[PDB]
Structure to design on (1833 residues):
């Protein structure tokens, strides 16, 4: 049958049928494969063995690989899904699985490796790093090929005993939705070699016929024993060929080890692998029809590389070959596939000029215009070798010139682009539209979706194609027949109408009438609309959703408008499929919600109005651009073009060679995505600064100013007298940043005043006013205040050094980290684990960490997911070494002819170099005397002072902070975190516990509580939450504290300050509410208060320093809970979706909270 | 001065001088490097910075690799010692260290990888598994070369910003005792680019001039940003070449990225890497003196591979080349070095027949008789390709036939074998005898020790050599001038008098 | 424990008079806990395949004594003593029951006979040193213990890395 799937689902479909066990661990973009396999097991889908697949989630990809090996050695057919850094951790086990000849299939959504920077996007870097493990490697070029070749891999591995890596391009294929022929499980089982499966069972470890495997061998037999597996590899190519013939007879689709396409007398041939083959074949068809003698060799079975099967498909007329590799091996003579082609042709004396290139690293676009550029390079007198395609390399001059733009799309293919907002329903609707057309027409359908790094309010661009011929266009849409914009704010911001065909369709969602079109649309846009004679349609979907009662959901409304004008299918048939899909989507909803979505379809059809524009629009002239502000070179040359969706145009000379970026760049974004912003009521405000404390984006802060500094203030900058003996004679004001606020509503909820001093007002009504207010507050001079930073009110007067990140609205993680920068940000270094905290904390080109007026701020670095603790541990050793080098140079200065005041500060620094305040005090004393002391010296004395001046950046003691998520701390990095805590080094570990893998969509973890439902835990987690804090207490010298900002502000302040001052390891586990819980982010702070008050989350502090003072180290900060336990669980969707078996799990959760509280009461006694 | 050391001590000697931090984790045969570095720090040995090396042990090599990255990014020169399965666990961090262009040197006692079975013995399987990380890779063939090239890497990595993997053959070199010229710490500091060290300090993570590194990048800039490091790799060969001349001016021993040995009009040339180069050069001397036109190319700088420096030392008379790899990549078209040699000769239109083979997996013996077989295969009418040497492959017929046994040891070299019992003092005594002869005569001295898998009561076989000429015999003793048996039980049990002159 | 336990060509683990004995396997240093964890899943999968074929035998025309032992085994497949007791009863009736059957009944009995080596409940043992359990494999050991699987981890604590010289 025909279904619309993506590469991930197509792979999991085959993997589920052929496997008994599947040990998995989540990593983008391979995690959808394991997610859908777990759901099928939860609903009881049977494999070819009549059982449900057993899915086991491990602590890391290393643990998964070991489990695969053990499951295979004990007699169970097992598979797994991984990619990129996860595949690297499996490489050691892959050598064993290949060495022991165990049948196995790894499904890999090939993704770039983290080098100078992280990239979750697709290339072959990960697969190439395992090409020497002895695994076979099979490449799929399309979603249909993922379906077919996954079956080829699972069938061949049983026959050959050689394990297979079946890999496909990350995102470009794993997330591309296509209508494909799906193979039925019953048809697969008729092709399985059951004799081979039974033979695999006999090789299993069993006490009734025991054997020994994995021995240790001396030099006398090791070489021979390694060569004893040679026959199995020699026969593997022929086995895959015969298996490919089996699939061919079943499906009719013919695969070979290497496939050829193009002119039979071709002289220029490209050899490639993966999704690029689709783009190349599409281009080859276009060029061959135009008479060019070109061809393409698709590599399916990369390892073992069969010279016989490659030369069999190489036409004898080939004179020049260009090999394209989707990876980069720096310093290597060539990339892997290029070296193989060059080798095999040399071994057979073929006089063929071979040239290699690189393309598509990290999902770089690779379109037919580039393919012709590769072909044109073969036609030059001297073809450029070791080239790149898709970039402008103006440094090393390896890039090929994209001369002209060609359109190789087959005639009759429809092409659409959809500009949407984050989570507004656009992407989901397009997925539904593809399923509609694919299920009800003979047309092939394709969908690809471009997402943003910003988690909320980001831009999404959908690329859809439909045609009567198979869709090989594995690239973004170049010439669109229809363009839809679901957010009027994009009008004038992005080049929406780029490349639209003459006479195409432009669909806009806006409240603007035909007359307002003259004043609202920019001149360049009006010129394109008129010159290209576009059919311009408009619809006020927001007005419709308000009148119907759907709120602001416009997904159904805009989808109806699309089918009405696209003319892809009969309009009447489209309306039926939409309403039929509405029943499938809103059938479980109430009867009132069902008829509302029906009214959306009906009202949308009558509200869609075509805009008849005057022909004079073609002559419209742009308005005079304002005087541009002098921005930094990085902002002007890098950040602006990237945010303008033009980053692909930046040449190589734009970037640093080591992936280093400046700090404090998010303050230049000013996205202004909030629907509502807080308005401050000066008369109700008690000056508590809690609103600045809980803001997940630092968009609201208190400002102090002497009355003289308020001279040129606007009339709306209303202030009040400052409360407190420290701020006597000063003015006070709580000011919000309108363009940086997210509209989450946490600050309005936390305001404890009698009358609410913060009320959510719409942005557009107060945007002009609040902009001038914030611009004035930012230009206020620094104000020296003596408020105690240990209090909540006093701490918020310090400048936040973490601002305007890409975290979601109301995120529960960023308020913790923001507070740390306000206390110790002047002198801290951050080692941040991979995860959400690294995504909003370090996504190029914007950096949310900033500096104060002196230019000092946190230095931020992220290594890998599993090594974050040891990453920061190494930093501590180096910083200690850098302070040791300085202390040696200062001690030599004591014996030098220097000022007596200089010696006093130097001796004072040496005595207190390990104290934060004393080192800053005497360190700043040394800094003040340095410029004059150098001027008064000469000769060797000047050189001794110049060496101290070179190291003055290490006078102030540093504070190492290791920040990471619960998935890092509880699972993959726990072994490393355990080691760093036991060492006793002066490090501070901050665990942002969201109880899930938040970034990758919310998968199960050891931090997940009993009964909680998340991805990889469809039926709920049975085992209880692992107590990380209890294990760290077993050392006795590790400071452990459990905090929750929403529950107690004072308890969080005490634990953080005690943890930082403790000369030893400190562990802070903070509860961070997240959108993956399924709650209203408006009450994120309130949800943390209910969690502690109901006994769900404990608050304690384990102070080893109290043990040295003869006191009890364990202090329970909240002993008696007052709220109901079951009532807190029912307030979050992550527990209500389980409801049945839920009542059995809820009882275990309540009993564990009483036993955990009773366990803490015994330790406190 | 002249001292009798092994490969491990020679490496740790240089690494201790050039490093401030060394994060380590034990794994045979690289653990002796970290052991002796710990003893030196406890006894107060100073590096070129006047302080003792800070040694930190982690929970695994993965933790060690992460600590190296953090220590480098924070501004301390750091090294580490690992091998085999340990090197694999460091590969993920190696991509970051190379991508961020941090100066660094990993010292590796190259050891086999665990496949069908574990092997603690030496081959290049581990180093080849990291050839795509972007680290530079430098191979030393003898204990003397370990001393010199370890300095070459430490000097070059500061200048090139490209981290280096300096590797030597496990056991065959790491545990081979030889009298070598030791480079004084004061002499190293005269060659260090101190400007490069201070520049490395300015790039460190510091709150007083903060920056962000290790960001996450979208498809729009990731490709370009990866190519922005192209100039650093293009310049690395020239930097290594110039650093090698600095060591040449100091020691008198001339190294190049690729070194040639043999007849200048050679027609058959073997390309190899590691300790095999010594056995091949010893054989080449024997064959060239016999009139055969053979040669040998030693690969020193494997990555980045400089085609210019390789072709400069390839004689124009070469018609056939045999490439030997000390690794196995199952199912691959060829082994790594064979694929590189085949590529570069193809890119320059050289009509040279190239053939690849495998040798010495898990410390399999590789002696001159086998080297002649490799040369004899090149002289055949149709040379066998994708072959093996040192085994009898009667299944897939890849092994070359060892036709005759030849003695290429330089004349005047004394050779002794000592059959001892486990932990009876024989090995320790032979080590002391080598130190005696090396310190008090002009003779070169070599010691290699064969151990047993049994932990108590095993058989030990010591192979010692002394001569007036440098000892290139990195193989077990073929013809012994003296054989000593310290256990009467061996009489009638083992072929003690085997090969005795 | 892997050097004296599994250095080729000598194997210290042996069999009893019936020919049954421990099967021994070593993967890597860091993955030993998860290595045995995967084995536990596979044996559980192998017992399910046998128990499924036995449940079909309940509905098949076989002798009542054959059915009596099968019902007893299905009730006690998870007990060490009971699974061996009724399992050997099944082994004694298997050759005679195949002789008295034909057609699909013979194939159902041959499928029981093919899997008779999983009637007796297995005992998975995860053996390793202190360096594995305290250092490199602790993260994996932590996870396998937290899973709750019926595995037996034996930590031979020598307080050092004994094999590599005592680190
Ligand atoms: C970014 C990326 O590739 C992420 S973020 C993440 C989990 C984050 O969950 P955590 O609880 O630790 O933090 P949180 O997001 O704040 O909830 C994974 C598994 N990955 C994939 C992954 C897998 N394995 C490895 C070695 N590296 C990465 N980056
Ligand atoms: C054999 C080998 O290479 C050994 S045995 C061993 C420690 C054994 O100590 P343990 O306490 O765990 O057990 P014990 O020997 O009984 O004391 C190490 C680190 N190594 C080296 C090593 C390092 N790292 C990895 C991944 N694998 C290995 N094999
Ligand atoms: S509404 Fe949310 S984002 Fe806006 S200022 Fe208040 S807390 Fe900050
Ligand atoms: S939370 Fe309310 S009372 Fe407190 S500072 Fe903010 S606006 Fe004022
Ligand atoms: S932790 Fe949750 S709320 Fe915060 S940015 Fe990540 S997904 Fe969004
Ligand atoms: Mg999390
Ligand atoms: Mg031990």
């Amino acid at each position: 049958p025909k279904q619309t799937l993506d590469g991930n689902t197509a792979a999991a479909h085959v993997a589920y049928a052929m496997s008994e066990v599947a040990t998995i661990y989540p990593i983008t973009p391979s995690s959808p494969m394991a997610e859908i396999a777990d759901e099928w097991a939860a609903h009881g889908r049977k494999n070819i063995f009549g059982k449900t697949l057993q899915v086991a989630e491990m602590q890391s990809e290393a643990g998964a690989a070991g489990a695969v090996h053990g499951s295979l050695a004990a007699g169970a057919l097992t598979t797994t899904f991984t990619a990129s850094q996860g595949l690297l951790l499996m490489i050691p086990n892959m050598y064993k699985i290949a060495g022991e000849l165990l049948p196995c299939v790894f499904h890999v959504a090939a993704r770039a490796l983290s080098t100078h920077a992280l990239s979750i996007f697709g290339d072959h870097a990960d697969v190439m790093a395992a090409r020497q493990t002895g695994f076979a490697m099979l490449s799929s070029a399309s979603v249909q090929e993922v379906m077919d070749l996954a079956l080829v891999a699972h069938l061949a591995t049983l026959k050959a005993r050689v394990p297979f890596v079946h890999f496909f391009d990350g995102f470009r294929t794993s997330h591309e939705v296509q209508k494909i022929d799906v193979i039925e499980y019953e048809d697969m089982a008729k092709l399985v070699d059951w004799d081979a499966i039974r033979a695999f069972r006999q090789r299993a470890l069993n006490p009734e016929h025991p054997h020994q495997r994995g021995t240790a061998q001396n030099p006398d037999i090791y070489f021979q024993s390694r060569e004893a597996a040679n026959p199995y590899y020699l026969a593997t190519p022929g086995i895959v060929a015969q298996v490919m013939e089996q699939v061919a007879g079943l499906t009719g689709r013919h695969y070979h080890l290497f496939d050829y396409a193009g002119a039979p007398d071709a002289e220029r041939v490209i050899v490639s692998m993966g999704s690029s083959c689709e783009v190349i074949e599409e281009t080859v068809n276009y060029l061959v029809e135009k008479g060019e003698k070109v061809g393409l060799i698709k590599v399916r079975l990369f390892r073992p590389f069969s010279a016989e099967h490659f030369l069999k498909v190489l036409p004898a007329s080939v004179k020049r070959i260009a090999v394209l590799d989707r990876t980069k091996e720096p310093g290597s003579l060539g990339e892997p596939l290029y070296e193989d082609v060059q080798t095999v042709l040399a071994e057979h004396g073929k006089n063929i000029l071979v040239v290699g290139g690189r393309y598509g690293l990290g999902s770089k676009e690779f379109n037919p215009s580039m393919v012709k550029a590769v072909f044109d390079n073969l036609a030059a007198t001297t073809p450029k070798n070791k080239f790149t395609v898709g970039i402008t390399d103006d440094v090393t001059h390896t890039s090929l010139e994209i001369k002209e733009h060609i359109d190789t799309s087959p005639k009759g293919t429809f092409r659409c682009k959809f500009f949407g907002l984050g989570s507004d329903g656009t992407v989901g609707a397009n997925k539904n539209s593809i399923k509609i057309i694919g299920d009800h027409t003979d047309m092939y359908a394709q969908g690809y979706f471009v997402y943003d790094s910003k988690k909320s309010g980001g831009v999404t661009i959908s690329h859809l194609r439909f045609g009567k011929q198979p869709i090989q266009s594995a690239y973004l849409i170049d010439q669109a027949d229809l363009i839809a914009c679901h957010n009027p704010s994009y009008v004038g911001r992005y080049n929406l109408l780029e490349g639209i065909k003459p006479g195409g369709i432009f669909l806009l969602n806006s409240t603007w009438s035909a007359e307002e079109m003259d004043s609202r649309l920019p001149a360049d846009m009006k010129r394109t609309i008129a010159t290209k004679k576009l059919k311009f349609y408009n619809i006020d979907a927001v007005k419709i959703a308000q009148e119907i009662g759907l709120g602001s959901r416009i997904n159904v409304i805009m989808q109806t408008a699309f089918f009405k004008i696209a003319n892809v299918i009969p309009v009447d048939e489209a309306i039926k499929y939409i309403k039929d899909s509405i029943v499938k989507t809103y059938g479980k909803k109430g009867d009132k919600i069902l008829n509302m979505n029906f009214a959306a379809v009906d009202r949308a059809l009558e509200a869609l109005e075509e805009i008849k524009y005057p022909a004079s629009w073609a002559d419209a002239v742009d308005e005079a651009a304002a005087t541009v502000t002098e921005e930094p070179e990085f902002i002007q040359k890098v950040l602006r073009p990237i945010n303008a969706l033009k980053g692909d145009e930046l040449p190589v000379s734009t970037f640093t060679p080591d992936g280093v970026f400046p700090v404090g760049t998010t303050k230049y974004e000013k996205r202004g995505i909030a629907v509502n912003i807080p308005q401050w009521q000066p008369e109700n405000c008690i000056q508590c600064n809690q609103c600045s404390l809980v803001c997940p984006h630092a968009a609201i802060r208190p400002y102090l100013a002497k009355p003289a500094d308020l001279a040129g203030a606007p009339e709306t900058f209303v202030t009040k007298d400052a409360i407190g003996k420290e701020a006597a004679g000063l003015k006070f004001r709580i000011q919000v940043s309108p363009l940086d606020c997210t509209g989450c509503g946490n600050c309005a909820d936390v305001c404890p005043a009698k009358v609410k001093a913060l009320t959510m007002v719409p942005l557009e009504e107060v945007t002009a006013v609040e902009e001038a207010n914030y611009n004035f507050a930012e230009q206020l001079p620094e104000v020296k205040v003596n408020f105690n930073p240990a209090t909540v009110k006093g701490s918020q007067f310090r400048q936040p050094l973490l601002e305007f990140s890409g975290a979601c609205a109301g995120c529960g993680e960023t308020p913790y980290v923001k507070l740390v920068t306000q206390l110790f940000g002047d002198r801290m270094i951050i080692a941040n684990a991979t995860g959400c905290s690294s995504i909003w904390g370090g996504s190029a080109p914007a950096c949310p960490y900033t500096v104060n007026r002196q230019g000092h701020g946190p230095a931020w670095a992220s290594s890998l997911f599993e090594d974050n603790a040891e990453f920061g541990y190494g930093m501590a050793l180096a910083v200690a070494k850098r302070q040791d080098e300085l202390a040696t140079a200062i001690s030599k200065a004591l014996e030098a002819p220097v000022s007596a005041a200089f010696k006093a500060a130097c001796e004072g620094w040496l005595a207190g170099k390990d104290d934060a305040d004393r080192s800053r005090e005497y360190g700043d004393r040394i800094k003040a005397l340095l410029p004059g002391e150098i001027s008064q010296a000469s000769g060797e004395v000047k050189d001794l002072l110049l060496d101290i001046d070179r190291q003055k950046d290490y006078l102030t003691k540093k504070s190492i902070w290791i920040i990471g998520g619960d998935g890092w701390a509880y699972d993959i990095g726990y072994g490393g975190l355990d080691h760093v805590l036991a060492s006793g080094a002066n490090v501070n570990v901050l665990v942002l516990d969201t109880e899930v893998y938040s970034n990758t969509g919310g998968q199960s973890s050891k931090a997940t509580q009993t009964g909680a439902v998340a991805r990889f835990a469809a039926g709920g987690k049975f085992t209880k939450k692992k107590d990380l804090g209890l294990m760290a207490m077993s050392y006795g010298y590790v400071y452990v504290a459990s905090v929750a900002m929403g529950a107690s502000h004072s308890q969080l302040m005490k634990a953080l300050i005690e943890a930082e001052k403790y000369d030893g390891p400190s562990l802070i586990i903070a509860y961070a509410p997240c959108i993956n819980h399924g709650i209203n982010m408006t009450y994120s702070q309130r949800e943390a208060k209910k969690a502690v008050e109901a006994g769900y989350w404990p608050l304690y502090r384990y102070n080893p320093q109290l043990a040295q003072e003869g006191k009890n180290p364990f202090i329970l900060d909240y002993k008696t809970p007052t709220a109901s336990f079951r009532d807190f669980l029912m307030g979050e969707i992550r527990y209500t979706s389980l409801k049945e078996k839920a009542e059995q799990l809820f009882a275990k959760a309540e009993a564990d909270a009483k036993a955990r509280l009773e366990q803490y009461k015994k330790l406190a006694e």
About this structure: Chain A touches chain C through 60 residues (CB under 8 Å). The pocket of iron/sulfur cluster (ligand 4) is lined by residues A 680, 685-691, 734, 750-751, 753, 757-758 (CB under 6 Å). Residues 414-621 of chain A form one domain. The longest helix of chain A spans residues 868-894.
